[PDB]
Design an enzyme around this catalytic site. Structure first.
Site, PDB file in Angstrom:
ATOM      1  CG  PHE A  51      -2.022  -0.962   1.198  1.00  0.00           C
ATOM      2  CD1 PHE A  51      -1.699  -2.331   1.292  1.00  0.00           C
ATOM      3  CD2 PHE A  51      -3.374  -0.586   1.030  1.00  0.00           C
ATOM      4  CE1 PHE A  51      -2.650  -3.306   1.178  1.00  0.00           C
ATOM      5  CE2 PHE A  51      -4.380  -1.647   0.833  1.00  0.00           C
ATOM      6  CZ  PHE A  51      -4.025  -2.927   0.955  1.00  0.00           C
ATOM      7  CB  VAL A 133       5.218   0.919   0.786  1.00  0.00           C
ATOM      8  CG1 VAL A 133       4.892   2.238   1.587  1.00  0.00           C
ATOM      9  CG2 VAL A 133       5.764   1.170  -0.632  1.00  0.00           C
ATOM     10  CD  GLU A 224       2.691  -4.914  15.234  1.00  0.00           C
ATOM     11  OE1 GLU A 224       3.366  -4.786  14.217  1.00  0.00           O
ATOM     12  OE2 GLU A 224       3.008  -4.298  16.294  1.00  0.00           O
TER      13      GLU A 224
HETATM   14  C1  LIG Z   1      11.672   5.331  17.206  1.00  0.00           C
HETATM   15  C2  LIG Z   1      10.642   4.190  17.103  1.00  0.00           C
HETATM   16  C3  LIG Z   1      10.972   3.034  18.060  1.00  0.00           C
HETATM   17  C4  LIG Z   1       9.861   1.973  18.051  1.00  0.00           C
HETATM   18  C5  LIG Z   1      10.384   0.568  18.365  1.00  0.00           C
HETATM   19  C6  LIG Z   1       9.239  -0.449  18.496  1.00  0.00           C
HETATM   20  O1  LIG Z   1       8.715  -0.637  17.156  1.00  0.00           O
HETATM   21  C7  LIG Z   1       7.334  -0.400  17.092  1.00  0.00           C
HETATM   22  O2  LIG Z   1       6.644  -1.455  17.771  1.00  0.00           O
HETATM   23  C8  LIG Z   1       5.223  -1.270  17.784  1.00  0.00           C
HETATM   24  C9  LIG Z   1       4.595  -2.319  18.710  1.00  0.00           C
HETATM   25  O3  LIG Z   1       5.128  -2.151  20.031  1.00  0.00           O
HETATM   26  C10 LIG Z   1       4.670  -1.376  16.354  1.00  0.00           C
HETATM   27  O4  LIG Z   1       4.991  -2.669  15.789  1.00  0.00           O
HETATM   28  C11 LIG Z   1       5.346  -0.293  15.501  1.00  0.00           C
HETATM   29  O5  LIG Z   1       4.929  -0.406  14.113  1.00  0.00           O
HETATM   30  C12 LIG Z   1       6.879  -0.392  15.615  1.00  0.00           C
HETATM   31  O6  LIG Z   1       7.557   0.739  14.997  1.00  0.00           O
HETATM   32  C13 LIG Z   1       7.964   0.528  13.620  1.00  0.00           C
HETATM   33  O7  LIG Z   1       8.898  -0.543  13.478  1.00  0.00           O
HETATM   34  C14 LIG Z   1      10.173  -0.375  14.179  1.00  0.00           C
HETATM   35  C15 LIG Z   1      11.026  -1.641  13.983  1.00  0.00           C
HETATM   36  C16 LIG Z   1      10.838   0.915  13.637  1.00  0.00           C
HETATM   37  O8  LIG Z   1      11.189   0.734  12.267  1.00  0.00           O
HETATM   38  C17 LIG Z   1       9.921   2.130  13.774  1.00  0.00           C
HETATM   39  O9  LIG Z   1      10.524   3.301  13.177  1.00  0.00           O
HETATM   40  C18 LIG Z   1       8.572   1.847  13.082  1.00  0.00           C
HETATM   41  O10 LIG Z   1       7.668   2.913  13.320  1.00  0.00           O
HETATM   42  O1  LIG Z   2       0.180   7.684   5.198  1.00  0.00           O
HETATM   43  C1  LIG Z   2       0.335   6.463   5.068  1.00  0.00           C
HETATM   44  C2  LIG Z   2       0.487   5.647   6.198  1.00  0.00           C
HETATM   45  C3  LIG Z   2       0.669   4.271   6.043  1.00  0.00           C
HETATM   46  N1  LIG Z   2       0.694   3.695   4.753  1.00  0.00           N
HETATM   47  C4  LIG Z   2       0.871   2.224   4.572  1.00  0.00           C
HETATM   48  O2  LIG Z   2       0.753   1.573   5.882  1.00  0.00           O
HETATM   49  C5  LIG Z   2       2.046   0.943   6.159  1.00  0.00           C
HETATM   50  C6  LIG Z   2       2.337   0.987   7.681  1.00  0.00           C
HETATM   51  O3  LIG Z   2       2.634   2.337   8.150  1.00  0.00           O
HETATM   52  P1  LIG Z   2       4.134   2.771   8.653  1.00  0.00           P
HETATM   53  O4  LIG Z   2       4.803   2.033   7.542  1.00  0.00           O
HETATM   54  O5  LIG Z   2       3.525   4.249   8.539  1.00  0.00           O
HETATM   55  O6  LIG Z   2       3.999   2.046  10.080  1.00  0.00           O
HETATM   56  P2  LIG Z   2       5.333   1.638  11.049  1.00  0.00           P
HETATM   57  O7  LIG Z   2       5.681   0.594   9.910  1.00  0.00           O
HETATM   58  O8  LIG Z   2       6.125   2.959  11.241  1.00  0.00           O
HETATM   59  O9  LIG Z   2       4.177   1.321  12.059  1.00  0.00           O
HETATM   60  C7  LIG Z   2       3.044   1.753   5.321  1.00  0.00           C
HETATM   61  O10 LIG Z   2       4.213   0.987   5.085  1.00  0.00           O
HETATM   62  C8  LIG Z   2       2.288   1.943   4.030  1.00  0.00           C
HETATM   63  O11 LIG Z   2       2.332   0.712   3.292  1.00  0.00           O
HETATM   64  C9  LIG Z   2       0.542   4.501   3.612  1.00  0.00           C
HETATM   65  O12 LIG Z   2       0.571   3.983   2.494  1.00  0.00           O
HETATM   66  N2  LIG Z   2       0.371   5.897   3.776  1.00  0.00           N
END
Ligand SMILES: CCCCCCO[C@@H]1O[C@H](CO)[C@H](O)[C@H](O)[C@H]1O[C@@H]1O[C@@H](C)[C@@H](O)[C@@H](O)[C@@H]1O
Ligand SMILES: O=c1ccn([C@@H]2O[C@H](COP(=O)(O)OP(=O)(O)O)[C@@H](O)[C@H]2O)c(=O)[nH]1
Ligand SMILES: CCCCCCO[C@@H]1O[C@H](CO)[C@H](O)[C@H](O)[C@H]1O[C@@H]1O[C@@H](C)[C@@H](O)[C@@H](O)[C@@H]1O
Ligand SMILES: O=c1ccn([C@@H]2O[C@H](COP(=O)(O)OP(=O)(O)O)[C@@H](O)[C@H]2O)c(=O)[nH]1
Ligand SMILES: O=c1ccn([C@@H]2O[C@H](COP(=O)(O)O)[C@@H](O)[C@H]2O)c(=O)[nH]1
Ligand SMILES: O=c1ccn([C@@H]2O[C@H](COP(=O)(O)O)[C@@H](O)[C@H]2O)c(=O)[nH]1
Ligand SMILES: [Mn+2]
Ligand SMILES: [Mn+2]
Lengths: 268, 268
Positions: A51, A133, A224
């Protein structure tokens, strides 16, 4: 190819099989030449959903360029790019046997993957892989992942105990998981399976999220949290190690990772 | 149940997953409580075939008594006892949900399992397990073995290199395997799978043996040589460790065996 060594562990530093006998996929646990033969003999076709809505269309060029270098090379692949901006999808040159379709949009992802996974034009497609993405491929991601149902160990939690996992903890939510339950914490950014098992997972998660919405609750980590509830009750037939969903800026290159295969692109 | 430990190997002394990602089933690699739930939710029924021809009817009493204590307890089981002497089959008392049928006989085993596995009265049966009778159960043999297709590591060869394996080496035989090919040496005394995969294996081995017979060749270890050829080309989805086919008088109790589950009864 080399003979397997019954009396030599594939890994001495990590768990390579779950307690329900699903392989946990790390480097050194598979011979890709054998797997590639098995899957080519079935003419396997892999669909990949991704997406890119609003600003995230910017991530598509590197995502697709690197998928062409590392994702399922030599097998049949169909990309399905879900976007609100079809003109912004970059025209990346694909290898033979690989196609890309743009699906304009418009709970978004599980609902849209569920609707899409039920369409008859997937008759040809054998497995679906569903990814974020904001990522790039840096190394091999191939048919070693394919199985009826897989999830991926979240790179922040693989060494955590279950009470530290950020599961939904409110009993009023469909995603609720008690403090003494849970096998792993799976990342919502990479799951997949056969078309049938992906239909079942995305329908269950979307129907669960609609229940929570009717009840005025939003699970802590949204889809998630529902993915983790689903994979607790319907255990995956393979689990991908964090090689397959890594953030190097956050977490470096630990000794237990031999390859960083699919990695986060830094963002705001 | 206990949380799996991502950073702790299930075993440090043995291989627990094959290079094509099939689990190799040893003690410490599975939580039977999880597996028993998964298989009870499908009301799984296991058929067991065993042949007792001529003097070998003497082995049935201990084989069945010990199967009742250790084989698939709590699941539905149907024994199929193939014999030239139906009156010699001992009347052993069975637990609930377990049945025994005597099939009078009359290449014998693969031909007879192939014919039998195609019969409509197996509609209820989900998996077949095919074993020697000169054996006894000493410990748990349960649903951890079940999978579409399994073979068992021969207890004399698990530590051997492939050139030492006693595969058929004459190219004129259908069971032929070249000196530089082969993953493991499987024992003919314990294999199984889903009904469909057992139909396919026993038909292939029987049709191969009829070719060899027409050509005036008998493979070196008879149906075991054809079983090894088949499982080289159609790789099993689980491999049972030698816990599941052991000879203690011959081979003792080595450190790598935590349990001796199904063991040879000494004979002449
Ligand atoms: C600075 C951000 C630190 C966050 C670490 C934990 O990762 C996040 O975990 C939550 C669940 O507790 C969600 O899975 C969330 O999508 C995670 O953040 C994303 O993935 C991590 C590995 C990192 O790439 C972050 O920048 C993303 O936003
Ligand atoms: O404004 C947005 C926010 C999210 N996404 C989709 O949703 C996924 C998960 O969001 P992000 O990747 O923003 O989440 P983290 O992986 O930081 O939770 C992204 O990879 C995109 O595939 C998108 O297309 N546009
Ligand atoms: C005194 C017998 C020693 C034989 C050891 C090797 O086992 C035999 O291996 C061949 C293939 O090379 C066949 O698989 C054969 O059936 C095996 O013998 C049987 O199984 C072993 C473990 C032992 O129980 C013997 O008594 C059996 O005859
Ligand atoms: O006279 C015989 C010889 C063999 N068998 C069956 O064939 C299997 C394999 O033979 P054995 O067990 O004689 O082979 P090893 O296992 O010593 O090769 C036996 O377990 C029986 O199930 C039998 O019933 N009567
Ligand atoms: O326990 C092992 C050891 C090696 N290999 C793989 O087998 C090939 C060479 O042997 C390599 O791809 C290696 O990763 C496995 O699959 N499992
Ligand atoms: O890596 C492991 C470690 C333990 N167990 C099993 O989990 C249960 C207790 O934990 C036991 O059945 C044990 O064998 C596994 O399946 N895999
Ligand atoms: Mn992301
Ligand atoms: Mn025997």
């Amino acid at each position: 190819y080399p003979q397997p060594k019954v009396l030599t562990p594939s890994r001495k530093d990590v768990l390579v099989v779950t307690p329900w006998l699903a392989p946990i996929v790390w480097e050194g646990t598979f011979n890709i030449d054998i797997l590639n033969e098995q899957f080519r003999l079935q003419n396997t076709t892999i669909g990949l959903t991704v997406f890119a809505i609003k600003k995230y269309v910017a991530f598509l060029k590197l995502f697709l360029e690197t998928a062409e270098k590392h994702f399922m090379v030599g097998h049949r692949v169909h990309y399905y790019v879900f976007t609100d901006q079809p003109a912004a999808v970059p025209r990346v040159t694909l290898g033979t046997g690989r196609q890309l379709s743009v699906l304009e949009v418009g709970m978004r992802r599980m609902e849209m993957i569920s609707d899409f996974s039920e369409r008859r034009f997937l008759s040809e497609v054998d497995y679906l892989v569903c990814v974020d993405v904001d990522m790039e491929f840096r190394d091999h991601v191939g048919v070693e992942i394919l199985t009826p149902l897989f999830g991926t160990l979240h790179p922040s939690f693989y060494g955590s105990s279950r009470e530290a996992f950020t599961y939904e903890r409110r009993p009023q939510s469909q995603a609720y998981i008690p403090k003494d339950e849970g096998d792993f914490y799976y990342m919502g950014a990479f799951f997949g399976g056969s078309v049938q098992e992906v239909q079942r997972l995305t329908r269950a998660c979307h129907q669960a999220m609609m229940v929570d919405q009717a009840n005025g609750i939003e699970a802590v980590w949204h889809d998630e949290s529902h993915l983790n509830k689903y994979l607790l009750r319907h255990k995956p037939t393979k689990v991908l190690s964090p090689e397959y969903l890594w953030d190097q800026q956050l977490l470096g290159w630990p000794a237990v990772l031999r390859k960083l295969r699919f990695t986060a692109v830094p963002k705001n």
